[PDB]
Design a protein around this ligand. Structure first.
Ligand SMILES: [Mg+2]
Ligand SMILES: [Mg+2]
Ligand SMILES: [Mg+2]
Ligand SMILES: [Mg+2]
Ligand SMILES: [Mg+2]
Ligand SMILES: [Mg+2]
Ligand SMILES: [Mg+2]
Ligand SMILES: [Mg+2]
Ligand SMILES: [Mg+2]
Ligand SMILES: [Mg+2]
Ligand SMILES: [Mg+2]
Ligand SMILES: [Mg+2]
Lengths: 163, 160, 163, 160, 160, 160
């Protein structure tokens, strides 16, 4: 209702990285999965929401808008403003778009319409194309949905994690 | 062995698209790329050339570490990326540092790993995807002989 | 009227610098004036507007909001959204706040109210405090004015440059 | 010569205020500083201490090159920054690398240049200026003996 | 083919010598190097090994871009740097990323350019020149088979 | 007191060896160093001088933070590094920022720590170890007076 959703995001990959890092969900170790095969770099800080389980068996992915990147493993208390939905070779994948919680410099961003269109297009473009040069990888759908849909998915993923 | 000076405008890894104004010598930020992409190699142009697109001939230089915008690198050609976009031809000569024995094993286009050539091609095909009216009609790699003939023609057009 | 003001800014100091660089207006050489005496860093990319002369004998100062810093000497075509007015030991100083011209990712910033308040406060704080530990330096006034005042000052400075 | 391990949370030059959660060991971004300031030295806390503010005792470490967040540095105290803010005391122990002969000339607070001590003081006085209700009542530098006694007291409080 | 996890302690280009404390898993600053030198490759150790020096077996990993201290990289051996210094034997296994086809052309020590191997050797021969009581008696490159033998020795010593 | 403008060519920490072409003022990449070493100070030359080697007189500048290639720094001499190599004499003037009270404690060569002077020497003695036909016969530090004498010699040769 009036009480806004928040959660902790663990950042795995800082904005501007071509190294695709992963944080192990059991040990907390950071691993280099791979150097990307395309001349692309992560459009925002990238990671996952703590204590969630998405429909793909992993913690629910998160994209965080920041004034300055963090590094792999760093926690950021964040709030959702939208969600990126896609289908690739492994099926559906959802990524929640967030901003820092309790920071007045982000109060103007409350929903997906508050983010410049070209910035959302840029984020989409990354995920549509970053595996273009990897064999057997493809994208069949990609689109943006609003904060309300994002929050519904976060709540579902909290429930799956508890179960 | 052909050799020429390349002015690097954009270091490898940059999303800021720097451009030298050829009238004045100043470095300008043309744009922050609209796509989440970064230049796959150090990028610039060959000094004292005039290409078919009316500008100096573009050049890509393979390096172990990027330089700064505006830096000259003595280079030699090993191939060329030939593309056609909405405006016509837009050739980019692929080079390595001249006089450096660490690059002697790279003499022609077949000596550059396919993974690297494919990533360079991917960059130029897609980097303007989000700009209206921009698209790429053709994009192919050609050999050193092809590169050298084009450099020679562009040198002559600069002198004329 | 309907045709928006633009100009070229030469950036002297990238955002986040404690090295205070200057671009020579005759030679175009970059000089290190000094390392700042305070633990502060330039809040935005900082420089001056080409072909202007402010009331202090220098080209009119400019602050440029960017997604990523440039380096000293780089030109950026920009448009004004406001102006910072201050008085220090050398008298009045004015600094025009700008965003990149023709970039739709900045269309939402048209005037000084479109910049988050805390971000304007942060910029002010820099100029109020960065010379705190330098002998004989002080600030007696600092405030923000709108795009219309900024444009009037830019126009005056263009006129002074021509004269 | 007193020696202890400092966990660096924030490298010199950072506007991101990282903080170790002492319950879990994780690194958290507490905030991006609201002022245009940057940590004047590598900054963190002394392991196995419990200060008067209920938290581990804060430490500043002078280094020739910053480390990464979470890195341990064996350090020895040369002085202490004593402040009083709206909540009470908030001491910060000033240290140099232990066992490193390049720092042997720094033994007490008088051996650190005034310019550096003044910049550190300026940071802690002003960095929360734009946060409502935050202000600094007192801020002074004290010597190694003062630092050592406070470290010792904080070690004992951690054991109790 | 043999592969293992390498924990990188020191990214390429560093003059800070970081080390993992193998009891805790914490990263520590051992020291800032005394020479104007920087690690020529990402540097670390192979997880779940015990070298004859009593530490986990050292590893050098060739990469297109460096990682952060503490990062795991799945790697495979292509050779080994054998050194004898003041404290006796020292082996460092040279590796490339495992399961990455961009490195398939590197199968043994002869596939790494001599200029890179010479630079790596030069680092380890000279980086402790300005530290007292340090010297190197021998420094030599051996092939993949010898590297794999030492990894297996070190796996067995870890289990014992 | 003597002071002059130094143009910095190479920031501290660089393995790219940049040089200004003194006819044009352009920055050029001479080469990527063949050794795993990095410039220990910001490095350049004194404007409007002519050394006995026929180039502008080299300068090393101590700074709290490095600059960019091409940046001017007003500096004053505190000593000089004298070297004899394959091409004969080579002098490099050691400097600090002029008019900056944070450097007033450095008036002569004895005011710079031996660890820093030794590291600087080590760089110039070893950075060309893996380039053929290079060697150093002598490398020695001299005081401010000798440095100032050489600056004056080089000012006179520029005018002549
Ligand atoms: Mg998936
Ligand atoms: Mg997922
Ligand atoms: Mg072209
Ligand atoms: Mg003024
Ligand atoms: Mg002014
Ligand atoms: Mg405290
Ligand atoms: Mg070992
Ligand atoms: Mg050993
Ligand atoms: Mg030795
Ligand atoms: Mg010379
Ligand atoms: Mg010479
Ligand atoms: Mg030699």
């Amino acid at each position: 209702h009036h009480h806004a959703m928040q959660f902790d995001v663990t950042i795995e990959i800082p904005k501007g990285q071509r190294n695709k890092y992963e944080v192990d969900h059991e040990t907390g170790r950071v691993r280099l999965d791979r150097y990307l095969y395309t001349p692309m770099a992560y459009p925002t800080d990238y990671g996952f929401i703590e204590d969630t389980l998405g429909d793909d068996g992993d913690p629910l992915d998160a994209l965080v808008l920041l004034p300055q990147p963090v590094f792999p493993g760093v926690l950021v208390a964040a709030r959702p403003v939208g969600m990126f939905r896609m289908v690739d070779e492994h099926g559906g994948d959802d990524k929640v778009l967030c901003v820092p919680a309790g920071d007045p410099r982000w109060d103007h961003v409350q929903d997906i319409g508050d983010v410049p269109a070209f910035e959302l297009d840029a984020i989409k473009h990354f995920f549509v194309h970053y595996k273009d040069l990897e064999p057997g990888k493809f994208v069949k759908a990609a689109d943006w949905v609003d904060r309300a849909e994002a929050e519904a998915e976060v709540q579902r993923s909290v429930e799956r994690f508890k179960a």
